[PDB]
Amino acid sequence: GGDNSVFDIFELTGAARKGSGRRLVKGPDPSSPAFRIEDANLIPPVPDDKFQDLVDAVRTEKGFLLLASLRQMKKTRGTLLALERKDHSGQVFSVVSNGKAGTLDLSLTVQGKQHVVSVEEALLATGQWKSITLFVQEDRAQLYIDCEKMENAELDVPIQSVFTRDLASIARLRIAKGGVNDNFQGVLQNVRFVFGTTPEDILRNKGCS
């Protein structure tokens, strides 16, 4: 894309610098840190200014590409990221690797109503490294798992419905944290939003990292 088109969430949080809530370990990418989650509550939020730039990119594109590498404990339901209200009253968006259901769940809360959909046949919690590419556009979600599998789902509302002009003033982006007892268990690496590019381009670059 153009200006501010790649957002690496762990870099933005400063998690690599701050010794709290994780252990730095190896991952598929030999050139970047990987994060074994210990206490997700202690991993800093994305700063407000950075988050508002992300929000504006999503609202502009009417969607996003989200890349992540994960090594998740079997049969666990683990939040990849969530947008949490600063008043502690709940989340407005999350992406959960649901190892209890074998799905990737996408939740949006708009106008007081929670809407959740499962991308089915997306068993990501295997105790082994997996790479995903999630492409959300309008009310459509398409998930590519490693370089072998595509699974799709339809959202009840367009993705941009949640991503408002002043969202950063009322909510924060948290990594690996969400729900009740749904913090991520395992390791994450290279959790990145990418704009102005297609899954086709990512997968040929072998973003099946």
Side-chain angles (χ1 to χ4, degrees):
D3 291 348
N4 285 335
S5 58
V6 183
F7 294 79
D8 182 290
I9 300 306
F10 278 117
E11 284 188 6
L12 296 171
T13 66
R17 298 331 135 206
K18 189 35 175 265
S20 290
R22 85 301 178 271
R23 186 176 182 145
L24 299 184
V25 304
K26 290 163 187 67
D29 182 347
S31 78
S32 62
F35 299 81
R36 178 170 292 279
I37 309 300
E38 291 172 333
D39 187 346
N41 293 308
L42 301 181
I43 301 172
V46 175
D48 291 2
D49 58 346
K50 303 299 183 192
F51 180 45
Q52 198 61 64
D53 298 341
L54 176 58
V55 171
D56 302 338
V58 175
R59 189 174 62 260
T60 292
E61 168 163 323
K62 296 179 189 288
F64 55 78
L65 202 54
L66 174 61
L67 309 178
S69 299
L70 71 60
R71 185 180 178 119
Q72 184 177 179
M73 192 180 308
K74 287 187 268 191
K75 296 282 165 58
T76 63
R77 177 171 58 209
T79 302
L80 307 184
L81 55 90
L83 309 189
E84 70 160 6
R85 286 177 178 279
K86 292 172 169 183
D87 63 13
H88 302 283
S89 62
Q91 53 164 75
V92 298
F93 176 66
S94 64
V95 178
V96 177
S97 176
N98 188 338
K100 293 170 141 45
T103 58
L104 185 75
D105 301 335
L106 311 170
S107 177
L108 284 165
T109 303
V110 173
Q111 282 287 113
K113 293 198 204 81
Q114 167 203 83
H115 297 101
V116 191
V117 67
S118 295
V119 181
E120 295 283 338
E121 301 165 21
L123 335 173
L124 305 171
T126 62
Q128 308 290 332
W129 282 103
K130 296 218 159 229
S131 178
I132 62 179
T133 297
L134 175 67
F135 183 49
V136 178
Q137 291 280 94
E138 293 281 10
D139 58 359
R140 302 169 324 248
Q142 297 182 324
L143 174 70
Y144 298 82
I145 307 162
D146 295 312
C147 257
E148 37 246 76
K149 193 168 196 193
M150 187 194 80
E151 302 297 333
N152 310 127
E154 184 168 55
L155 306 176
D156 207 38
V157 296
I159 185 65
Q160 65 273 19
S161 303
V162 153
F163 289 82
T164 56
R165 255 184 309 163
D166 208 0
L167 186 68
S169 69
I170 67 179
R172 302 192 181 90
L173 191 167
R174 306 303 304 273
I175 191 143
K177 174 186 184 313
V180 43
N181 305 307
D182 298 320
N183 291 355
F184 192 84
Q185 300 180 255
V187 196
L188 292 172
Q189 193 184 42
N190 284 6
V191 178
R192 296 184 176 160
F193 288 89
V194 182
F195 295 90
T197 202
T198 63
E200 188 204 312
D201 286 342
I202 292 292
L203 297 187
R204 292 204 76 89
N205 298 0
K206 292 267 156 276
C208 309
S209 175

